[PDB]
Subunit: 222 residues, 3 copies
């Protein structure tokens, strides 16, 4: 079985080259299902396409990516070592390297997802960004929102999962915990480090911060 | 040396196929040491097995994984781009993608380790979960424990390393800092965002949270 | 184009072997630009070298790494699935696995960067460590500094980027948020979980922590 199915991977790689896809190495490509694509698609080494996948025009997929049952709009750039499962990307999204989209990730036009970021059942609005070290689960995020490094939707209480809704034009400071269910109004700002347990008004700053203090001459243990 | 040792990798890949291992691509497989395996093992592209490794039955290892000196029980699923070194997994553990187990990681039956999670000298009990963006070092974690996204054992003070002990049936809220040495009693709940500096009683909620407030009409700088 | 340029990758791999580089698999190596190297360099599977790259002696590069326009000093160890772009590493740095250095990352002698750590326009001093789940952007970090898991430079306010400066001999507790622009004096200690909004004095402990409390007999929802 193994050698035979490996041969069928060469066939596919070859047919893809003939149909105008740029494969960096046809010997390091795997298609387990069906791929539909537009023009000028570029696929790097060690990519694996699973299930039923569709790529628009000029999509670029970097080394090591795994894309399963997903829809990827024109001009998207998927950077190295990014895993995508049952997600939809609109045109001109940039994700990765080291991004992980679980089923139900919906990215709107121009959205950005950076390194060590995970999405599941979450929509990221147009031009919105989640650049670092973040989990967004069971969330609606509006357009032109900035999701600071370290932000986490607390969506699961051990019994049920609950929905977070963030409005347009929101700035989420780093290391914010969004305790679901919670809604953050359009234009609001969440201070870095905030534990958000209550709805935030439009154009409001939400904060839950102890003033910084200092003790002089502190010796660490030797 | 290089071409010769590459040939010896083909030999191994071939012998593994003959012995009933399912290798997705024998040309993208590396065994640097010895592998013992049960029946129905499936190994994807670009896996590297190092040192002395043993896999039970029906173990599935996804693309890009690196497994060194480890013991992996029956039915485990190791997802893509996961690195495992000197770890033991009981039956039916699921780890990755992008998990990183350092020496001394001990996972008990059915345990789960998600993306961007690191373990070192830490035991994860039966059916317990650490799904996201977490470091567990020098820790004992009991059975049926949930470790929320963003949790970190503070195990090292710049001089020494100290042990964290979490009991059975504990819910660790997201972004908890466990300041070692510390013990959290069976059934307890740690509120999201808590800095745990003192032992937590059985069935207790521990919390260290400033009430959320809000200022109206907050303008961000242009 | 594809098959022809693939052939030129074999040529390069072959020339590199002749020039004394240890390539684990010449069929899984890609050079897109120019590589200069010293003696005893070891390069594992699925590495991609981009732009103009220089490696000192005895550099070891693990599986899946992507290195572009970078300078890597003698004795460095780059662990698996690490992405490096426009960075300089001094001698004896260890980075990865799963590290991500963006342009302007400058690592001084013996520095360490661990899993799920991102640097951009940031200097890491001699013997300094950032082992886990951290973003350092637009930062100066001195020598013999420990950057705890979960630390984040808050460098961007939605309008501008600002600089964080950490002195020599500083201990940054886990999950610290550094709100830029901010300076932390030589020898200081930041308590785990602190939101640093004000400059920290030399040899001072900075802290912003609510005392832990506990409520007895807390039932989670069923
Ligand atoms: C420098 O970047 C920041 C500064 C800052 O306050 C000075 C805050 S904040 O959240 O404390 N905050 C914010 C956030 C955005 C704009 C202005 C301010 C003032 C203040 C209330 C956040 C960041 N950046 C990130 C990514 O968190
Ligand atoms: C919705 O998910 C959560 C809710 C929640 O409080 C309403 C808390 S909590 O930690 O603030 N907390 C918890 C945690 C579990 C169950 C019930 C409560 C009430 C409260 C004291 C935590 C989460 N989830 C995660 C992963 O952190
Ligand atoms: C056990 O490791 C720690 C202990 C600790 O306090 C007991 C603190 S702390 O930041 O709360 N803190 C520190 C930090 C370093 C040395 C001594 C102390 C005492 C106290 C003020 C931090 C860590 N480790 C990490 C990685 O954060």
């Amino acid at each position: 079985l193994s050698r035979l199915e490996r041969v069928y991977q060469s066939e596919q790689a070859e047919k893809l080259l003939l149909a105008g896809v740029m494969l960096r190495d046809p010997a390091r490509f795997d298609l387990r299902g069906t791929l539909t694509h537009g023009r000028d698609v570029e696929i790097d080494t060690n990519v694996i396409i699973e299930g039923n996948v569709t790529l628009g025009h000029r999509v670029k997929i970097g080394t090591g990516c795994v894309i399963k049952n997903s829809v990827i709009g024109d001009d998207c750039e998927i950077s190295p070592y990014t895993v995508v499962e049952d997600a939809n990307l609109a045109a001109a999204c940039t994700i990765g390297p080291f991004a992980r989209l679980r089923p139900g990730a919906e990215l709107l036009e121009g959205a950005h997802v950076g390194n060590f970021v995970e999405m599941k059942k979450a929509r990221l609005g147009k031009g919105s960004k989640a650049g670092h070290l973040t989990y967004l689960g069971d969330a609606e995020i509006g357009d032109n929102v900035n999701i600071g490094a370290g932000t986490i939707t607390c969506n699961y209480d051990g019994a049920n999962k609950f929905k977070t809704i963030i409005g347009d034009d929101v700035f989420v400071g780093s290391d914010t915990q969004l305790v679901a269910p919670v809604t953050v109004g359009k234009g609001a700002t969440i201070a870095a480090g905030t534990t958000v347990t209550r709805n935030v008004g439009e154009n409001a700053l939400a904060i839950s911060r102890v003033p910084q203090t200092q003790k002089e001459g502190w010796r660490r243990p030797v």
